[PDB]
């Protein structure tokens, strides 16, 4: 009946709003005001594919569906090693159903407002152990949904599920107005720069209206690990254009007139992919359950964290409702996570962690073959809505050849 | 707009009813009358877990929810090698949400009636190539949902996805009244007889009311491959009791007064697990798409075929609706299957095919440990609602030990 959530983010607010609609009392702790979120720095590029969007629709939370531009496909390009300014791989495929990117600076504050209107108890505090000890005495279940916040480290890192202990990419975001729209359909335009990094770009909705989000990922120490000397929004926009001019001149043609959406429409950072154990034990001996990025944190290279957050909150909501009047004990907590991990997130995580490493030959062959086998390009693109569908053919050479043949037979 | 389906079974009727509700015209071919199905031989033990049941509920097709007894857990027993009449493993765990078994002799005819009432065009014919050639000219998509019927062999067997080319178990069913109900909760009572076979029993609903279904699976050539000399319903009931008396005397105690529900409440047969390619090309060059057991046929040992059929028809329905006015071409057909297979059925199939082979030591250790680690028994039982959750720990020794420890830590 009474549920506490620490962290008013994507997963926490989605879960809390779903619980309020199911008749629960919900207490939520936020460490920021809605307006400070709206006007602060961007946090994500939040490209959500149709399955995730549908979870929001089923809860009545798709408040920006008509205003947010759709992302209608996925494109992949690789620079040509010899031919200057050209591409050796350049293909695209349409998504079976649109994706959408609604700036968390819009969504989270609006969902905070809705949470209050629907009877939630919003408490404004940077929560720590004392708040978790208090919550665990007055609530039937307490979840930690604090994303990358320091309190997420209460949960023990799971070494076996975490192959990396260091960041594998240097990240940056740039929200811009003025970019030439993609024709004849919008897409996530992926640009893979061998041994250097990746640039992704797609339309989105932010606090000043429709835009495009530039996403940069650089191999640490390399030419796209280039944000440390950037100290002003103007320097950040300049650096963004320098990457395109240097590595993706075909995308620079779309950017002759770009401007930041706002001075806080920029981000630079990095983190190590990490999986954690879901049950944390407080000094009192009482227990809390971690949600979404607290327990499974992937590098953004595959565009999956928000998708994972919506699917994780959906799985946890269903588990809570199915438990009914039963106690939310450690066993129940652990099984709830296990269903998320073994059923889904282990495959998103293995796929993303593989793609962070240098691509093996059979992967380069897949990417080339997709350009000449449209069913394979379509399988690649739509796999982003459910990355389980990449296994076993993406990771294994022999299986990749079998799947290429399957796709070729229906081309 | 116009869809044809050959085979009025679980998957075909579920899909057809979902398409009619979405505004499509649907033509369906049945090779039997509803009454001949109601009064004919049983076809399945159709134990459906909550995710599958929920697919039926979301379509308004759970017409027997209140009359059908619930199956509330899963139990596992193994005879003791030394101690006579005793068990060395004997444990149970509650399902997070109930399962239900509604005799296909009840469900399929009732869904056939509903299909007509909702505007479907039901055509009564044993359909063959000529009907598929006619359908493919007058309909936008033609699916074959004929289960184990001979026409299913139009689709090419997929050797790489089919490790077996012979039956791995001799099957039998016995629907009975009078069995002592299980206390204190109902369950699928699994009995694993090392090197011989398996006996499963659980409550269900049939045409004469609530019953229990006895399910026998025998290693070919062994003592539970014992149905060839059975030629009358009385001999079939006697043989059923002989198995329990010989191998599971603890279950015989529940059966002192059992009687067949009806003389057609019996079945004996066998088949080779088979996966097929989903697109078949007719002599004209036009194409048809296989559904459910036509393309993925598993031995019943894991209780998954009906569950797969409901999840396959749900995936195909969603794919059709998402395709909208687009052509149902071979590429679309193949991608629809690929999403079912790579996303879900490959894992159900790998798990079931492993369990048909002799269990390795780490599996026997898992089964024993589940009896002393209740979180592990619960993970095992609830894995039947989504067998993806068994990977990778069920199939690998080191991973199994890790998961045992995870479960032990929350016990
Ligand atoms: C650069 C970048 C690009 C990305 N691009 C994409 C993309 O294109 N597609 C995609 O799907 N995902 C993407 N992601 C991932 C996605 O943004 C996250 O995975 C998602 O926000 C996770 O949701 P969450 O609920 O777990 O955490 P969050 O949404 O981060 O919410 C956690 C909240 O808790 C707050 N909090 C922290 N500590 C406390 C405390 N002690 N008390 C109270 N509140 C606290 C935090 O400030 C935050 O507001 C990207 C991530 C990054 C960094
Ligand atoms: C002994 C046994 C026990 C089982 N126990 C379980 C269990 O406990 N749980 C579980 O989930 N699953 C179980 N299954 C599996 C389950 O019964 C099937 O997987 C499920 O019925 C498959 O659905 P379907 O739509 O593909 O085919 P079906 O439901 O078999 O439908 C196919 C229909 O098409 C008809 N047909 C065939 N040829 C033609 C033609 N040319 N023209 C017209 N119609 C035609 C067939 O007669 C049939 O009516 C069991 C199966 C067996 C054999
Ligand atoms: Br597809 C896709 C969508 C968004 C992002 C952000 C980084 N990589 C991505 C891939
Ligand atoms: Br669990 C379960 C449920 C039904 C059947 C039928 C054969 N084996 C089964 C396992």
TrEMBL record, chains A, B:
Tell me if Nucleotide-binding is a UniProt keyword of this record: yes
Q: Binding of FAD: at which residues?
A: 10-11, 31, 44-45, 47, 104, 126-127, 293, 306-307
- Note whether RNA-binding occurs among the keywords: no
Domain called Styrene monooxygenase StyA putative substrate binding: residue spans: 147-254
The molecular function GO annotations come to: nucleotide binding
Pfam families linked: Smoa_sbd (PF17885)
Please name the InterPro entries in this protein's record.
FAD/NAD-bd_sf (IPR036188), StyA_sbd (IPR041654)
Q: Which UniProt keywords apply?
A: FAD, Flavoprotein, Nucleotide-binding
Name used for this protein in its record: Putative dehydrogenase/oxygenase subunit (Flavoprotein)
Native species = Variovorax paradoxus (strain EPS)
Print the organism lineage: Bacteria, Pseudomonadati, Pseudomonadota, Betaproteobacteria, Burkholderiales
């Amino acid at each position: 009946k009474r549920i506490a959530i620490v962290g008013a983010g994507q997963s926490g607010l989605q879960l809390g709003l779903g619980l309020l609609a199911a008749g629960y009392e919900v207490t939520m702790f936020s460490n920021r005001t809605g307006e400070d979120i709206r006007r602060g720095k961007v946090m994500s590029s939040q490209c959500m594919f149709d399955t995730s969007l549908q979870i929001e629709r089923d809860l009545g939370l798709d408040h920006w569906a008509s205003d947010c531009p759709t992302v209608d496909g996925i494109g992949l390009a690789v620079p040509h090693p010899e031919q200057k300014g050209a591409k050796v791989i350049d293909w695209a495929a349409r998504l079976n159903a649109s994706a959408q990117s609604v700036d968390q600076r819009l969504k989270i504050p609006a969902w905070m407002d809705e949470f209050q209107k629907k009877g939630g108890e919003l408490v404004f505090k940077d929560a720590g152990i004392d708040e978790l000890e208090a919550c665990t005495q007055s609530h039937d279940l307490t979840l930690v949904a604090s994303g990358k916040g320091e309190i997420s480290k209460l949960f023990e890192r799971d070494a076996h599920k975490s192959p990396y202990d260091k960041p594998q990419r240097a990240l940056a975001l740039t929200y811009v107005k003025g970019m030439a729209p993609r024709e004849p359909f919008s897409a996530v335009c992926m640009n893979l720069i061998p041994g250097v990094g990746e640039y992704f770009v797609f339309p989105a909705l932010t606090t000043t209206g429709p835009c495009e989000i530039m996403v940069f990922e650089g191999v640490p120490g390399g030419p796209m690990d280039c944000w440390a000397d950037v100290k002003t929004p103007e320097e950040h926009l300049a650096r963004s254009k320098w990457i395109l001019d240097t590595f993706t001149p075909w995308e620079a043609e779309r950017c002759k007139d770009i401007e930041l959406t706002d001075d806080n429409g920029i981000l630079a950072g990095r983190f190590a992919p990490t999986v954690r154990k879901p049950v944390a034990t407080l000094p009192s001996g009482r227990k809390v359950l971690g949600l979404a990025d607290v327990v499974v944190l992937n590098d953004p290279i595959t565009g999956q964290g928000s998708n994972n957050a919506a699917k994780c909150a959906d799985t946890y909501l269903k588990s809570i409702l199915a438990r009914g009047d039963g106690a939310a004990d450690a066993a129940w907590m652990q099984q709830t996570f296990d269903r998320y991990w073994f059923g889904y997130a282990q495959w998103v995580t293995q796929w993303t962690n593989m793609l962070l490493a240098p691509p093996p030959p059979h992967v380069l062959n897949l990417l080339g073959s997709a350009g000449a086998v449209p069913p394979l390009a379509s399988a690649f693109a739509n796999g982003f809505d459910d990355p389980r569908t990449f296994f076993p053919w993406f990771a294994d050479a022999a299986e990749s050849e079998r799947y290429i043949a399957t796709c070729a037979a229906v081309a």
